[PDB]
Design an enzyme around this catalytic site. Structure first.
Site: not given
Ligand SMILES: COc1cc(-c2cncc(-c3ccc(C4CCN(C)CC4)cc3)c2C)cc(OC)c1OC
Ligand SMILES: COc1cc(-c2cncc(-c3ccc(C4CCN(C)CC4)cc3)c2C)cc(OC)c1OC
Ligand SMILES: COc1cc(-c2cncc(-c3ccc(C4CCN(C)CC4)cc3)c2C)cc(OC)c1OC
Length: 284
Positions: A16-18, A133
């Protein structure tokens, strides 16, 4: 003494972006290796600072093994190493499985237990912690049927922003009391109630089950904007649908009531994680 640090990365289980998560091998054992993007270094620093403050150890919290910073030619590599749960995330699991009463209750009570453990201040001990989150992709399924809560990159201790789909109304309308630690616990309880809804849909009753859907699937697009979510949650005050068929089942009727008490517009009216734990233990 020799210190065996070598981890063999075997397969990528998340991208992902992470950054990425890998299944790795260390001394003949599976580990999970999260490799952070430079864009998400602050999540590594927050999770590391928290575990340097308090070494959390709970059956329903993803088990910490290591935080590593390695020097590279022109960059820093940031790794978080944890226990590996081969069944993957609750999000993944709910797509290809239905649940019975016992498995549905075991899942949600284990999540409530993990969350109450984060939220409680213990003297001697741990500070109180809000996750910020919580969602089905940040919950892992264990072989014994219980779950554990993952990703403390946004966590706040008492003594990047949350996924928009799961944001509480006071986050979306920017009325949250940012100075008050209890506000962040109440934000987690809202997200918990959406997770409770995602799971309950997949519990069979009277031969009926709903397909896996993410919360608000019927009212917002994929990758909903902040505005999309604010209009649904704050302006129209919509809540996820409770299907009629739940009201024929005593378990799903009690879970529907629980969900409602996580979703009050007024954050201070929401149940505490400890009260959810008690309610869930008394079902069936
Ligand atoms: C540095 O890096 C990594 C290291 C390790 C690792 C591997 N073997 C042994 C150890 C170890 C633990 C504890 C003691 C001491 C503690 C106090 N003393 C009084 C007695 C004994 C010695 C050694 C470690 C920490 C694993 C890692 O990842 C899985 C590491 O990171 C990649
Ligand atoms: C990072 O994680 C893992 C580490 C290890 C590991 C390797 N060498 C030594 C140790 C160790 C020995 C002794 C103490 C204590 C004993 C009492 N007093 C004197 C203080 C010091 C601490 C640590 C460990 C814990 C093994 C693991 O799994 C088999 C780990 O997990 C993957
Ligand atoms: C949410 O957050 C973190 C999670 C984890 C983590 C721990 N165990 C197992 C997993 C996992 C394994 C496998 C699958 C799929 C892939 C293969 N197949 C298609 C079915 C199964 C999904 C998930 C993960 C992702 C580690 C983390 O850090 C090191 C996380 O960050 C804190």
């Amino acid at each position: 003494r020799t210190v065996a640090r070598d981890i063999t990365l075997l397969e990528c289980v998340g991208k992902g972006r992470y950054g990425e998560v890998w299944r790795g091998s260390w001394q003949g054992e599976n580990v999970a290796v999260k490799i952070f993007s430079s864009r998400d270094e602050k999540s590594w620093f927050r999770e590391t600072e928290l575990y340097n403050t308090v070494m959390l150890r709970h059956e329903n919290i993803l088990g910490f093994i290591a935080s590593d910073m390695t020097s590279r030619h022109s960059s820093t590599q940031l790794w978080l190493i944890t226990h590996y749960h081969e069944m993957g995330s609750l999000y993944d699991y709910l797509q290809l499985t239905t649940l019975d009463t016992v498995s549905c209750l075991r899942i949600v009570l284990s999540i409530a237990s993990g969350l109450a453990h984060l939220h409680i201040e213990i003297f001697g001990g741990k500070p109180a912690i809000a996750h910020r989150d919580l969602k089905s992709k940040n919950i892992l399924v264990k072989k014994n049927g219980q779950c554990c809560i993952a990703d403390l990159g946004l966590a706040v201790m008492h003594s990047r922003v949350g996924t928009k789909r799961y944001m509480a109304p006071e986050v979306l309308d920017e009325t949250i009391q940012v100075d008050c630690f209890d506000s962040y616990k109440r934000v987690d309880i809202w997200a918990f109630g959406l997770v409770l809804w995602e799971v309950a849909r997949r519990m069979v009753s009277n031969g009926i089950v709903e397909d896996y859907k993410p919360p608000f699937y019927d009212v917002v697009p994929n990758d909903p904007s902040f505005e999309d979510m604010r209009k649904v949650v704050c302006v129209d005050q919509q809540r996820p649908n409770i299907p009629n068929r739940w009201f024929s089942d005593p378990t799903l009727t009690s879970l529907a009531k629980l969900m409602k008490e996580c979703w009050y517009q007024n954050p201070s009216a929401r149940l505490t994680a400890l009260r959810i734990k008690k309610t869930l233990t008394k079902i069936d």
